[PDB]
Ligand binder design. Structure first.
Ligand SMILES: CCCCCCCCCCCC
Ligand SMILES: CCCCCCCCCCCC
Lengths: 396, 360, 403, 347
């Protein structure tokens, strides 16, 4: 026997998405359009042009009336402090982690890898450190905290987990994708940097991954692929989403005018690297698509490029509507949507696309390990009945 | 300057838990006829009632409460046409205030000029009607402790009884309970909805004890006694008493005031003026004697406690004056009298009341 | 053939430290003791006690007159802006990367993994994206940016690189570890977040790891072990080094009074966990000084070096690299270790088969050890951070330095 | 919106000690302030880092210009000395977004150059008092003003001239009872400054070559100016002059007083004043102030001032024409002024 000695020994391990918990923002936090515009008028009294720009950007963003913002951003002078950001981080991360631990029955002593990704908020000790302290994790845990890597960092985390799971047998990896938006709020009137204020909302997700063979039946999905693209080499595609300062000393995320075109290119490259891998022309390769909810414009561009139907690009639109731009964790809200409509059959291929600053564009392919039953503990438990709502072209 | 007694306030908004739906809400002719007056109601609570109560604890019941009062978070919209309360959830405006300088007792003992205008924050509707909050709720925390709840309520939304019901429902939900023309016509105001202050009329609060009220009634209920005494000590042609209808509970804000024009104690004891779309005013138009004795302001239950003082006042008063009569702080029933007069009339009333009961 | 095939497919890959370049601050930014104290007096005029505290903890800090700070702290008061922080990041990281690429002759396209490490500076796009744009790395590069993980993150990054080289055969991993000081300066006057102002100085390092067989004879070291400890479950060990705002609204790093005990416990647990892996059968208080040839203790301060020398009984000649790096470059954070190595390669002590034990402590409370084995005898060079001053070292570090 | 930074020598000095001769201690109370002006073409976008870079090497040959005053541990009132603790010179960055170089050149008296050259007295905190302030004022037009505030204890005005001269060279790339003029004064402790008992004011004015020739015919620029000023004031004047020889001299003092009173007329018991003690007539005459080049452009204008002037008053004369700065205590300030206003319309 020589074929077995060269096949099984050098066979990649299977990485399973055992479960995940999405954060459900409090039902007493919504930020309606009218309240947002009233506060915006109050903050930008001396810049009516900025107010008009914000109104135009927010009235065609596809967001709903149930999106949530941190308590610190509630005051008409929004004063984001370090304590407020830490409190929001604790809230979201611990809620998602508690939901995950109750769902999976996982013990804190069983967590071998812990990867936390959150772009803007990078405290010290890290976010993974506060998770470890909260759950008293093992003293020999592989704790990683990625920051500054944008909205695609979510999938990056998954990739990292996968790699680690190939090196360490019988291990569990917890991946916490979030974006604490209290420090991300832009305290200025520069038009280019006011988009994140209009679009970004609260969210988060705690994901459990495992190569353990005992999870070959409990697992929801089985990670097939994680493709990555980094257009940072191109100078134009590097400055696309650039954190910087305005002419008044305020830090914000300036978005380039050409951010559309470059984004397109990146996506194309990714679908040129994921095509041959899944090739037995993508609307028939996969059964479900999770396009990152980065604004209805990019979703429309991807739909017109890949020739997706209204129902295929529906979890992304409805996730943008219900939760807004929850950043790297949005990919998971979309997942929940597909699961809760009773559309997650066994063997179904799910393709997640997450594109963000860098300019990075990553994608992942999962396969449904088991048919997913509709559940009550989830971020869609109440609003799933109304959806798919009719998102209007312009709201007032 | 009493207006500077509070140094720094934090403003925020609170919205209904469930999106109302942006449905329209037509306003009756009576409502549009009182779109210039506002209610300022301040409740005081001692240190016990605020035992370990944070901002979130106070703001939590507001979401359910506004789910009930779906119009309290709406905004005025116009089609030139008649305004209506669009139910888009702009929310009510919450104002957190700190008064480290003084305590509740100092406020109770300080002069009443510009006294509670800084405990109940809130502007008028305009000049930007589409973005004007209809309700301002201010929680003020003093030096030694205790909390003051100041409600600024747009009268177009509802009568003062509706404001008292709003506060009472707030308290109950926090506890845990599960739910000579009488009306003058004036010049157009456009989209600012604020009566101009042609004169320098002043406001003052008088406190009457049970013994004083029963003693001064001999020369003439509590309301009739106070009204007759004020009329006799003020005129030294008609009076428009307001009574409202207190048969309401767990209901949305409504405006169902009852007027009574009397052409002096006997006059006190015993409707188509609005044409279609003018700008009207009746408070301080013909010496209104508004009352809230048929309310239960002191029946609030905050942490198993009751308010130590309730002050109700009217903004947008006309040229004549407004007399507000309210139940006193239990014990030996008293009476709080928040009244606005032109400076001279207020001075005469103060002199007469100081001569009689040494009240000034 | 069966057993041989099983062993070959089951044997872990070899990770090699092909080379590494350290940032050499120019001689224009050095901050003598007197100038630092004068700027402190000018800035914190209102609170004399904070100035006296800074003088007390800087006169016995064990630093020297050649430590460097970025060109934003030079001013009075400092004006740390995003542009200044980005400029410092470019100045340090691009210099170190250029030195690495010139030393190793590494083509940018040959870089497969890129792990960047900086605690308190986390721009968007990340510093890894900055490197990728500068050197035009590939679009399928495994790029990671670790931040918030403190001083020990330097040994976290390389650890990750190892875990990524054993999954991807024939690949290069560049690990950049720095600490940008401009977004690190406390602007308040509380006597708890000023110590990091006194100790921390600018520096960096870039490291090329590789599992390729061609980079096997020329490799400088072979990564033997990496042992990680995280005293984070304990609340005291978690709060010992905490980033928070003061009473005025300024972010800084508060250090608890009971920090020496926590750091000692973390070091003790780490050395206990690593003892079985490296100690010879003879020892199995086993002597750690009899299992390693060279030691690189993180230059977090004189107190920790004294504690380790007293516990492990290290001779004054084995903590020489740590003390001299602290004196020369100061507390360069995670990259300090990579300066200390360059001290034992320049005096000339890196013989083939030698064992190097690097111990890095930091917030979390994290504590990580690495054990390397000198692959080849390393010869002195003139393109090192110690090039112009290694002849004068070791110097006599006085207990108290008069102002 | 000025910005203050420090510059330290590139090479550590190791905490040397510089002994201050009795002359330096006696004259420690005075301060030189020299302001040079440079036109648009002399700059063409000079970064402050580029300007500061030469200072790192320059301070190596002027190391004493980075130390701090100190007293011996023997006693708390010992002989002051310059400890080379590498404190560094104080670099000031200023931007004039309202006035141009020409506007400042035409700008008249009443503290024209005080705003153009930052300075401070050596005290009351001697241990942390910079000895040298170098201020770069960038005007909206484009020209710069270099203001050098130089403690006189460090050196004489010609020493500051040599300092700025070598700065410019290395920037270009070149490799580096009542008759006694000195008066004892009440000790000032550790704060080296002289309070003014009267209305002590200064005025600066320039004489063109034509008027200088006319006055010489009426009567060298030194003699003409001395006679003119003395006659105008009349209707002891001890003169201070340079030694007469120098080549890349370091920070030192080689001034000479004329009646040449011997320098052995003082001790270390108390403090002393020389400039302005008895109508001093400091005259630099020749100097490389205008001979220096920055990017090949000669300085448009240079002005020198003395701070810590005595009660009687001082006169400083430099080769421009000729620039004269006269500092007086009393109403003679106006008197002489009006005389000029009647002859050359100077006012
Ligand atoms: C519960 C109501 C929260 C309302 C939050 C409004 C946020 C306003 C953002 C202002 C954007 C300029
Ligand atoms: C070459 C100039 C070096 C100046 C270094 C001074 C750094 C200031 C530190 C301020 C600490 C209070």
């Amino acid at each position: 026997i020589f074929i077995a000695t060269v096949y099984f020994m050098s066979k990649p391990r299977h990485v399973y998405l055992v479960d995940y918990a999405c954060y459900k923002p409090p039902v007493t936090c919504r930020v309606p359009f009218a309240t947002f515009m009233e506060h915006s008028r109050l903050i930008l009294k001396n810049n009516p042009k900025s107010v008009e720009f914000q109104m135009r950007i927010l009235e065609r963003s596809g967001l709903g009336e149930e999106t949530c913002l941190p308590p610190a951003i509630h005051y008409i002078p929004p004063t984001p402090t370090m304590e407020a950001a830490r409190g929001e981080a604790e809230l979201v991360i611990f809620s998602a982690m508690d939901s995950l631990l109750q769902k999976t029955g996982l013990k804190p002593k069983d967590i071998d890898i812990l990867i936390v990704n959150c772009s803007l908020f990078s405290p010290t000790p890290s976010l993974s450190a506060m998770v470890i302290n909260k759950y008293k994790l093992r003293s020999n845990i592989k704790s990683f905290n990625l920051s500054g890597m944008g909205c695609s960092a979510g999938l990056i985390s998954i990739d990292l987990a996968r790699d680690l799971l190939q090196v360490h047998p019988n291990s569990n990896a917890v991946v916490v994708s979030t974006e604490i938006i209290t420090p991300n709020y832009y305290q200025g009137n520069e038009r280019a940097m006011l988009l994140p204020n209009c679009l970004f909302r609260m969210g988060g997700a705690a994901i459990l991954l495992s190569n353990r063979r005992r999870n070959r039946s409990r697992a929801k999905y089985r990670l097939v692929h994680v493709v990555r693209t980094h257009k940072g080499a191109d100078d134009k595609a590097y400055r696309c989403v650039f954190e910087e300062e305005d002419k008044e000393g305020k830090v914000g995320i300036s978005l380039s005018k050409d951010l559309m075109a470059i984004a397109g290119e990146a996506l194309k490259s990714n679908i040129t690297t994921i095509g041959p891998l899944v090739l037995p022309d993508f609307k028939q390769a996969f059964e479900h698509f999770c396009i990152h909810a980065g604004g209805r414009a990019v979703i429309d561009e991807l739909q017109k490029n890949l020739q997706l139907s209204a129902e295929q690009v529906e979890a992304s639109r409805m996730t943008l509507h219900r939760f807004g731009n929850t950043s790297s964790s949005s990919l998971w809200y979309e997942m929940s949507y597909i699961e809760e409509k009773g559309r997650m059959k066994k063997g179904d291929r799910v393709w997640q696309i997450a594109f963000g600053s860098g300019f990075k564009c990553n994608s992942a392919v999962w396969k449904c390990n088991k048919t997913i039953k509709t559940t009550t503990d989830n971020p869609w438990s109440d609003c799933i009945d109304r959806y798919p709502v009719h998102i209007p072209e312009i709201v007032k | 300057n009493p207006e500077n007694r509070v140094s720094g306030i934090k403003l925020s908004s609170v919205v209904p838990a469930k999106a109302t739906g942006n449905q329209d809400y037509e306003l009756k002719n009576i409502d549009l006829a009182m779109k210039l007056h506002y209610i300022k109601g301040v409740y005081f609570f001692n240190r016990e009632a605020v035992r370990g109560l944070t901002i979130f604890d106070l703001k939590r019941p507001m979401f359910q409460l506004l789910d009930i009062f779906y119009t309290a978070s709406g905004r005025i919209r116009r089609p030139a046409g008649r305004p209506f309360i669009k139910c888009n959830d702009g929310g009510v405006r919450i104002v957190e205030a700190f008064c480290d300088d003084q305590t509740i007792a100092e406020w109770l003992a300080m002069d009443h000029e510009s006294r509670d205008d800084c405990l109940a924050y809130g502007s008028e509707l305009g000049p930007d009607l589409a973005f004007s909050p209809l309700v301002f709720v201010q929680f003020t925390s003093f030096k030694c402790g205790g909390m003051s709840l100041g409600l600024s309520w747009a009268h177009v939304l509802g009568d003062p009884f509706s404001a008292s019901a709003f506060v009472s429902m707030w308290a109950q939900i926090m506890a845990g309970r599960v739910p000579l023309y009488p009306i003058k016509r004036v010049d157009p105001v456009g989209d600012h909805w604020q009566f101009p202050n042609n004169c320098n009329m002043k406001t003052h609060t008088f406190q009457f004890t049970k013994k004083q009220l029963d003693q001064m009634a001999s020369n003439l209920s509590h309301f009739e006694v106070i009204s007759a005494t004020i009329w006799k000590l003020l005129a030294k042609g008609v009076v428009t008493i307001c009574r409202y209808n207190g048969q309401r509970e767990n209901e949305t804000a409504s405006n169902d005031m009852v007027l009574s024009t009397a052409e002096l104690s006997t006059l006190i004891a015993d409707e188509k003026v609005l044409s279609e779309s003018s700008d009207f005013i009746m408070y301080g138009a013909n010496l209104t004697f508004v009352d809230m004795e048929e309310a239960d302001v002191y029946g609030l239950k905050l942490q198993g406690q009751k308010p130590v003082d309730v002050n109700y006042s009217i903004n947008g008063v006309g040229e004549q004056g407004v007399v507000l009569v309210l139940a006193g702080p239990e014990e030996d029933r008293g009476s709080t009298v928040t009244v606005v007069l032109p400076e001279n009339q207020l001075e005469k009333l103060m002199n007469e009341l100081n001569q009689e009961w040494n009240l000034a």
